[PDB]
């Protein structure tokens, strides 16, 4: 499947955005992996261990542009 177009975000590996972790805190983040079958992405919250990476659907409002 193809990712949606959303302003301020590019859905590609290594692209940067802001992402809401499961504690509802925003962090500058990086797209690590994209699952194009499910439409979800592995998001890495910067300066956190990769054990805290989270899978977020690419149309989620847990993702927003990084200014």
């Amino acid at each position: 499947h193809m990712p949606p177009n959303r302003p301020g975000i590019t859905f590609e590996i290594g692209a940067r955005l802001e992402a809401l972790d499961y504690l509802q805190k925003w962090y500058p983040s990086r797209i690590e992996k994209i699952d194009y079958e499910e439409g979800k992405m592995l998001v890495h919250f910067e300066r956190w261990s990769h054990r805290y990476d989270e899978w977020i659907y690419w149309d989620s409002n847990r993702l927003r542009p990084l200014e």
Binding site: D21, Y22, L23, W48, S49, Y52
Partner: peptide, 6 residues
């Protein structure tokens, strides 16, 4: 830095 407490 961790994300849970107990």
């Amino acid at each position: 830095r961790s994300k849970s407490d107990g």
